Write a protein that binds this ligand. Structure first.
Ligand SMILES: Nc1ncnc2c1ncn2[C@@H]1O[C@H](COP(=O)(O)OP(=O)(O)OP(=O)(O)O)[C@@H](O)[C@H]1O
Ligand SMILES: Nc1ncnc2c1ncn2[C@@H]1O[C@H](COP(=O)(O)OP(=O)(O)O)[C@@H](O)[C@H]1O
Ligand SMILES: [Mg+2]
Ligand SMILES: [Mg+2]
Lengths: 517, 50, 469, 345, 348, 50
């Protein structure tokens, strides 16, 4: 079913409505061009960061201004730039189209769709460098943003308006953590409540296009593209796109934050965005510093990450939660860009390759991971069942050297050893399987209440899985009123203990034994 | 799963050629309307009916 | 007329001045002449930068020894073009498209420019089909992908060339499509060995070879990968049948770009690399891909400079790959071959949804045992195997047997040990390593696991030592 | 999602048809106007439409335009403007042959100060009393040059300069001003302008002559020999002052492209009268009534009297495109066709 | 007439050309308006270098996006001046002296230049005096120095904000003094939290807050400490009052100085810090001292890069520190407040 | 290939001081006579494992 005369009359009304009256415009000339940079004589009225139009529909950004020329970064198709071409002004700084038409689309760092699914109808445009919310325009971070990962939600809780750096070597699970966080908002979106719904923006900087396609497929398999936008600056794009992509993804989702909506943004490997900015700055001959970085790269990342905020109730109460990703080399968190982003953010989740290879997945180092918001980003049930978790895990880590000397240990020390082994097995989680907060509360209750001290270490995962299955099938009241009341009262805890005992006497361990105390 | 996705792949196999038939069928139809669009484009560029 | 004039000659970089209105476009090929009889040739110069005042900075693809400032430079009007079509199979080509196998061959073929844009994003689709090779360590811990991107990382002299020849033997011999091999800044002895060995195996007729070696100036080492990529892209987009692409030391491409960087007037980046490292690597690596319905299985050797995996070049190569086999010199020094690091290597399809529950579980248990062994190695070095637990000693014995069973007698390594090679099916690999992890061979010595095939070779070498499986 | 796939490939095909039919129609309109423009009265109508359009754009905010102070970074704008202010009263009494010998001796001094930069270094040092430099002047050329030339050299060294070469630029600029004054008292006040411009457009076509006149190593006498007969050819150069101007340029140019230097000369000539030059295009030569309309309306647009030049090229298919200063008013139907092709959905 | 014009804009660095007899002095503040409606603002530019030919190189304190070459630049004739007096208590300012919680407040106060010299040699105290705070652990194990510097080594969840409130209370009640907080490279979330917590503890009326935040160019983050120290110096010298200065991550002052040095094209030093690391640190820390009977005491949070105490930034900072208070989580878990580690803290 | 000589091995009395684990020849047994290729088959791997 082709809309034939639709197309016909559409281009016909366009061509009839074409009246481009001729007016003056201040122009310049390309004098030299190389490696994605072009210098332009003329344009006396051009401003910093102004978009320029090179012949053939090519776009540039005026970054360096001096008495001789304008040094501009070409945003694509640089091999078409030639010495002598005429450059025009646009009179505008970099802006992007914003709106709800971007939910479920994959766009450029310019608002242009690259998925081939048609045009994106936009509410308005938003400049890329609009300032951050003031120090008096903000509010304390109070609402949790559930990632669905028990390790994060229990140990390093993230709140709406907070910035939780995800930092790790490579193949440690950073993208998996962020994609699970995105997928966990599916029930919030299904609720239809704008106070609970989270819109997501995934910014892919410098990634292979098939990796972006795989991320999009993972988001589509879980119904997460109903509320997610992808800003993709693939590895083949110019350094200007890789530099602008997080600001484009943050200009979108600020239009939503200022409308009273709650947004989650992921900057996948900000390291590549810093590398692109360094390439641009070295090609513009700006003075290098440590690791050849321009000298305003800390500003580059802090300007971006301070726009994630929790707005005051007078401004609508919206929020933007940032999950920037940093890849380190050889677990060197003292490198320049890792140091900068650790300094900027409100908390860090450190992911180790060794922990990944030992079976600890997600490979989060709970000892060094930290959230400066803390218990203010947790519901009361999670705040109560996870308060005895950090000290328990630290005691287990201290006692790990005495694993084969339980008989040579205090009874309390052997108890701490077994409890810590159970708790380490409890914080493991498959990929692309986030848990709602009531189920994480039930799981950490199983852990810290003592109901796993009788289950073998190698059966804790299966026990928790089957118990949550049972409670989802049989005892939905516990989960339902944990979700509604945000706490675990004494009667709910009593019914939970009863269900746990019945399940234990029903459960069958792998060693043939009984998990009954 | 595999049944559903392989049979929707079959539906794609059919719809691709069907819609391409529709396209190259309308390709000959649109050529009748190119003259008016050309005339009005020229008229707007110049500013007179000719 | 519309001719240029050489102005400056600084090594491989040549500045050329043209008349107004006749400035050549970026990446155009220009022709200059060297008339000195001992070095008479025609220099090809690729326009790299527009310097201003009608000047143009170009990179030469041949050595500029004997070039005079002021000689005439002719603009050809297009970029470097190479021959494409079914006629390039069976022949050895230059980075410029000149046949070395048979000079003058392909001069009348269709010629494609070596500079392209990658496929559109709406044409890409993830590849998740396992390519089975017969190597236990690759099949188990880094399963390859049909139509995906594979890489061999390693320092100087570990296993990269031997492993890529092994994979040419295993994947490309019984293959039903086209093969393209790019020798990029490598040894000419190895290129001649590969040419002769493909000719004998009767597999050269399906392979197109493009060589630009270490003795070439940096322009050839920059553009040879693009030439071979253009041939493979023709076989993908026009012929449309199952290309195999092998690139020996894609790193050399990057390295060539850093040999001319400061001569092109670019401020150096962190570790001496060009500022445009990741951008050039991306504009090249994004053309090496499969589109929807058009498969290119790629396999690249990646040189890790000074064994440092944190070097910018391999560190930014890592993000362009579906499977990476990482070779360590620490594994090489122990005599284990292929010298694969099992704890540093990865694959995107090592997933229960792709390879199965048993494959995935056996791989995870192998990795966990090897990680625990790595953690215990320091104590064993200082304090000895005696101060470990009984469980830890059990794990250490299992881990030594596992790390020796991951090695294999390879078909391409018979020239180094005299022992012929072995192919092991993936089900046999999974079952054997499940038995090793459970501990069914804790009584067999550490040797008899070393450079063998499957379980039958294990039994034979164990009984040749006085043991029984 | 499969239904989504088929709908999206449908929409992609529709968009392909969209843009393809659009390009077909724009080519058809290009055909119509390209074979419709041949009516000369129609081209005049295109011109008059464009100018009545211009009749409402008034005014622009263009400021003054000066030829050489544009690149004068610092400490030389003041110098050259003080020098020209001194000349504003120094020149009014000189006689014609006085001016021609003044110009000759000044370009000789320019070639001198150009051939060796070591003297200019001791000659372009900043000091509020340069009486040692004035002595160098009084003891270097005093026995070889005339009185007014050494006087203008004195008042030239009397100011500080950004660099060494800017002083040579200033002096040869003075020679230019003197030759133009000689021409203005000769009644050729504007013939020199059109002569310079037409010769510039002639030299523009030939890159050979243009660039090899920029020979930065051939003797300056060789350069002037190059210029001699290719200039001294026919009635095409009847002006008797432009010969000396072009000679001075082709000998003392110092790396500048001749195609650009002669146009700079023309712009200095038109800037002497306080006027701006406007390089416009069209399909064919105008009818001078159109020239008058365009000239006066542009003078109203930019708030300064202007003079036009016509780089006629029939690839514009009517319309005009003025290029005053650095802002262009493009209205050639070629550019509008290109735009309509670009705005296609 | 006597105003300059913009010549070059390279990021935060702006070159301005003035008439021959109107070149602004070093550190002077210049004003240039950005008129693009989306980004319309007034840039303040601090003169950093005299380049010659009437050109000056200045560091901009706001983002220069939208700035055009040739626009008018006005010389204020003075350095960056902050409002001083009793009116700055209970209010939030930036490194420029603009009131954040009430814009336009303090514009009629007396204004003091932020670039000042330390007390003369004959005005310095040759005798070290202990500050009697009232806390048992501090007075006993790590006594503070009156007019001295105390490093603070506590993170989140160990009661660092409670200790800051406690010291504000004790300087306001046991010494009749005032507090000035300097958030150098402050997170806007934590700055808002500090503002709200001080207002809810009713100690904001005793404190003047000066926030140079992370989303600002390096010049503001480099000058915020001098702004807060100028307010503290007015309270000490002109009011006759013991002051307590709080510097947030003094390291971020060092880091902003390094970034400004990199932007100005200066050749880096060992490890990378600006060649004048020690000079800038001394110019800042020498104004915190006792003079004429009154004193400014400073509690400063110190970040140690890579936990390396031989790193040039902590090594240069510790050349001026008099005591160290490390807040421990092991002490905070036992319920001991303040959570001062007795074995890790020290005093000279 | 490379023959890596070490001062630690030299001092120990191993002379020539070849580090057998990191030394290699990329030509291999093709650079030997058949007798040497058959007696020193896996001698380098044997010494590395030793
Ligand atoms: N929680 C988990 N459980 C099991 N496997 C996981 C988990 N998280 C990640 N993985 C596996 O680890 C592999 C790498 O993870 P991922 O790609 O998310 O890391 P990354 O931080 O994106 O690294 P890179 O960006 O270098 O690819 C994936 O193939 C994935 O299957
Ligand atoms: N699987 C193997 N079995 C036996 N010897 C090997 C094996 N792989 C490599 N070697 C030895 O190590 C050397 C490594 O060379 P190669 O891996 O081709 O170098 P590069 O990695 O630099 O290309 C070879 O010359 C060979 O002698
Ligand atoms: Mg990732
Ligand atoms: Mg090799």
């Amino acid at each position: 079913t082709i809309p034939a005369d639709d197309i016909q009359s559409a281009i016909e009304e366009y061509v009839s409505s074409f009246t481009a009256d001729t007016s003056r415009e201040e122009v310049g000339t390309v004098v030299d061009a190389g490696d994605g940079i072009a210098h332009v004589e003329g344009l006396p009225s051009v401003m910093t960061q102004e978009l320029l139009e090179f012949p053939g529909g090519i776009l540039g950004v005026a970054l360096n201004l001096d008495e001789h020329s304008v040094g501009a970064v070409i945003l694509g198709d640089f091999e078409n730039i030639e010495e002598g071409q005429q450059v025009k002004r646009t009179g505008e700084v970099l802006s992007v189209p914003v709106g709800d038409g971007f939910l479920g689309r994959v766009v450029n760092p310019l608002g242009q769709p690259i998925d081939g699914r048609g045009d994106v109808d936009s509410d308005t445009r938003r400049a890329l460098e609009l300032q951050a919310p003031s120090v008096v325009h903000r509010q304390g971070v109070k609402e949790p943003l559930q990632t669905g990962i028990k390790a994060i939600d229990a140990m390093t809780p993230i709140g709406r308006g907070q910035r939780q750096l995800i930092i790790g070597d490579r193949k440690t699970g950073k993208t998996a953590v962020c994609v699970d966080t995105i997928l966990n908002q599916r029930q919030n979106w299904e609720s239809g409540d704008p106070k609970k719904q989270v819109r997501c923006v995934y910014v892919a900087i410098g990634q292979k296009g098939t990796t972006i396609a795989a991320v999009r497929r993972t988001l589509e398999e879980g119904g997460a593209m109903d509320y997610t936008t992808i800003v993709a600056a693939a590895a083949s794009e110019s350094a200007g796109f890789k530099w602008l992509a997080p600001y484009t993804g943050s200009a979108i989702a600020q239009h939503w934050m200022y409308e009273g909506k709650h947004v989650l943004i992921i900057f996948d490997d900000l390291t590549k965005q810093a590398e692109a900015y360094r390439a641009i700055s070295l090609l513009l001959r700006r003075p290098p510093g440590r690791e050849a970085y321009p000298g305003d790269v800390f500003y580059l990342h802090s300007r971006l990450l301070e726009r994630c905020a929790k707005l005051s109730d007078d401004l609508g109460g919206g929020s933007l939660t940032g999950l920037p990703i940093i890849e380190t080399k050889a677990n060197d968190i003292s490198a320049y860009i890792p140091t900068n982003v650790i300094s900027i953010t409100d908390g860090q989740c450190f992911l180790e390759t060794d922990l990944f290879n030992q079976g600890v997945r997600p490979a989060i180092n709970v000892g060094v991971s930290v959230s400066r918001v803390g218990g203010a980003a947790q519901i009361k049930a999670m705040k109560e069942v996870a308060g005895s978790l950090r000290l328990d895990l630290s005691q287990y880590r201290e006692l790990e050297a005495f694993a084969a000397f339980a008989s040579d240990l205090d009874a309390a020390s052997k108890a701490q050893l077994e409890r810590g082994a159970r708790l380490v097995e409890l914080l493991k989680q498959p990929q692309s399987q986030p848990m709602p907060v009531e189920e994480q509360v039930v799981s950490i209750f199983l852990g810290t209440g003592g109901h796993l001290d009788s289950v073998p270490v190698e059966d804790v995962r299966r026990f928790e899985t089957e118990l949550l299955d049972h409670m989802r099938a049989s005892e939905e009241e516990i989960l339902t009123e944990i979700r509604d009341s945000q706490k675990l009262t004494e009667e709910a805890a009593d019914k939970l203990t009863e269900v746990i005992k019945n399940f234990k006497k029903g459960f069958a361990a792998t060693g043939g034994g009984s998990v009954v105390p | 799963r595999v049944r559903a996705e392989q049979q929707v792949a079959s539906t794609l196999q059919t719809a691709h050629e069907q819609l391409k038939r529709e396209r190259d069928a309308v390709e000959l139809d649109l050529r009748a309307h190119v003259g008016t669009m050309s005339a009005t484009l020229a008229s707007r560029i110049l500013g007179v009916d000719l | 007329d519309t001719s240029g004039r050489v102005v400056r000659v600084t090594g491989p970089v040549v500045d050329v001045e043209f008349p107004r209105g006749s400035i050549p476009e970026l990446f155009n090929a220009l022709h200059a002449e060297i008339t000195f009889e001992s070095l008479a040739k025609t220099l090809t110069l690729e326009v790299a930068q527009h310097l201003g005042d009608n000047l143009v900075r170009t990179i030469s693809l041949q050595p500029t020894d004997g070039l005079v400032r002021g000689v005439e430079v002719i603009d050809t009007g297009r970029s470097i073009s190479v021959p494409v079509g079914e006629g390039v199979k069976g022949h050895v080509f230059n980075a410029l498209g000149d046949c070395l196998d048979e000079p003058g061959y392909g001069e009348k073929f269709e010629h494609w420019s070596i500079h392209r844009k990658p496929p559109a994003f709406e044409e890409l689709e993830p590849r998740t089909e396992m390519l089975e090779t017969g190597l236990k360590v690759v099949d188990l811990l880094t399963p390859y992908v049909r139509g995906g991107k594979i890489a061999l990382f390693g320092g100087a002299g570990v296993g990269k060339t031997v492993l890529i020849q092994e994979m040419i033997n295993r994947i490309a011999r019984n293959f039903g499509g086209t093969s393209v091999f790019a020798g990029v800044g490598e040894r000419t002895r190895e290129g001649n060995d590969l040419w002769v060995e493909l000719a004998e195996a009767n597999v050269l007729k399906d392979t197109a070879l493009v060589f630009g070696q270490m003795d070439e100036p940096p322009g050839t080492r920059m553009r040879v990968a693009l030439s071979a990529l253009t041939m493979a892209e023709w076989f993908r987009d026009e012929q449309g049948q199952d290309v195999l692409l092998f690139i020996d030391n894609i790193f050399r491409f990057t390295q060539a770009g850093s040999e001319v960087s400061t001569l092109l007037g670019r401020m150096p980046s962190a570790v001496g690399y060009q500022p445009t490292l990741a951008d050039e690597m991306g504009e090249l690596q994004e053309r090496i891909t499969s589109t929807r319905g058009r498969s290119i299985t790629s396999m690249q050797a990646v040189y890790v400079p000074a064994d440092d995996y944190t070097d910018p070049a391999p560190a930014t190569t890592f993000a362009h790959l579906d499977a990476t086999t990482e070779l360590s010199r620490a594994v090489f020094s122990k005599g284990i071959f292929p010298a694969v690091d099992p704890l540093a290597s990865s694959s995107t399809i090592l997933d229960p949804s792709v390879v199965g529950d048993e494959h995935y579980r056996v791989a995870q248990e192998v990795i966990r045992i090897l990680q625990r062994y790595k953690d215990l190695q320091d104590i064993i070095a200082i304090l000895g195997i005696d101060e470990l637990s009984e469980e830890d000693k059990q794990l250490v014995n299992r881990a030594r047997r596992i790390e020796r069973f991951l090695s294999q007698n390879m078909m391409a390594a018979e020239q180094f040990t005299g022992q012929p090679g072995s192919t092991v099916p993936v089900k046999e690999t999974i079952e054997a390593f499940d038995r090793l992890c459970k501990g069914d061979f804790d009584h067999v010595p550490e040797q008899a696991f070393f450079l063998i095939g499957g379980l039958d070779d294990l039994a034979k070498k164990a009984e040749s030592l006085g043991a029984k499986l | 999602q499969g239904a989504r796939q088929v709908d999206l490939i449908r929409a992609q095909l529709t968009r392909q048809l969209r843009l393809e039919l659009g390009h077909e129609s724009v080519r058809q309109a290009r055909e119509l106007v390209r074979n419709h423009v041949a009516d000369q009265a129609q081209q005049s109508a295109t011109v008059d439409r464009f100018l009545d359009q211009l009749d409402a754009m008034a005014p622009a905010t263009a400021d003054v335009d000066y030829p050489l102070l544009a690149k004068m970074r610092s400490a030389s704008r003041r110098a050259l403007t003080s020098l020209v202010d001194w000349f504003g009263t120094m020149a009014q009494d000189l006689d014609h042959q006085g001016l021609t010998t003044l110009a000759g001796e000044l370009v000789s001094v320019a070639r001198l100060l150009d051939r060796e930069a070591v003297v200019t270094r001791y000659l372009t040092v900043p000091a509020e009393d340069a009486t040692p430099r004035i002595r160098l002047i009084e003891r270097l050329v005093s026995g070889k040059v005339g009185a007014p030339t050494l006087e203008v050299l004195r008042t030239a060294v009397s100011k500080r300069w950004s660099a060494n070469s800017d002083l040579i630029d200033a002096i040869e600029h003075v020679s230019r001003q003197a030759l133009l004054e000689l021409a203005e008292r000769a009644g050729q006040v504007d013939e020199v302008e059109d002569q310079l411009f037409r010769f510039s457009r002639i030299l523009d076509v030939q890159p050979r002559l243009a660039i090899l006149l920029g020979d930065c190593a051939v003797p300056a006498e060789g350069r002037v020999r190059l210029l001699r007969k290719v200039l001294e050819r026919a009635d095409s150069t009847v002006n008797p002052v432009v010969v000396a101007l072009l000679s001075h340029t082709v000998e003392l140019l110092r790396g500048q492209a001749v195609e650009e230097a002669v146009l700079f000369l023309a712009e200095v000539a038109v800037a002497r009268r306080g006027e701006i030059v406007a390089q416009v295009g069209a399909a064919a030569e105008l009818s001078d009534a159109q020239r008058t309309r365009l000239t006066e309306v542009l003078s109203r647009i930019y708030g300064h009297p202007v003079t036009v030049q016509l780089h006629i090229d029939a690839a514009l298919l009517g319309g005009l495109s003025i290029a005053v200063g650095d802002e262009v008013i493009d209205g050639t139907l070629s550019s509008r066709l290109a735009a309509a092709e670009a705005r296609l959905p």
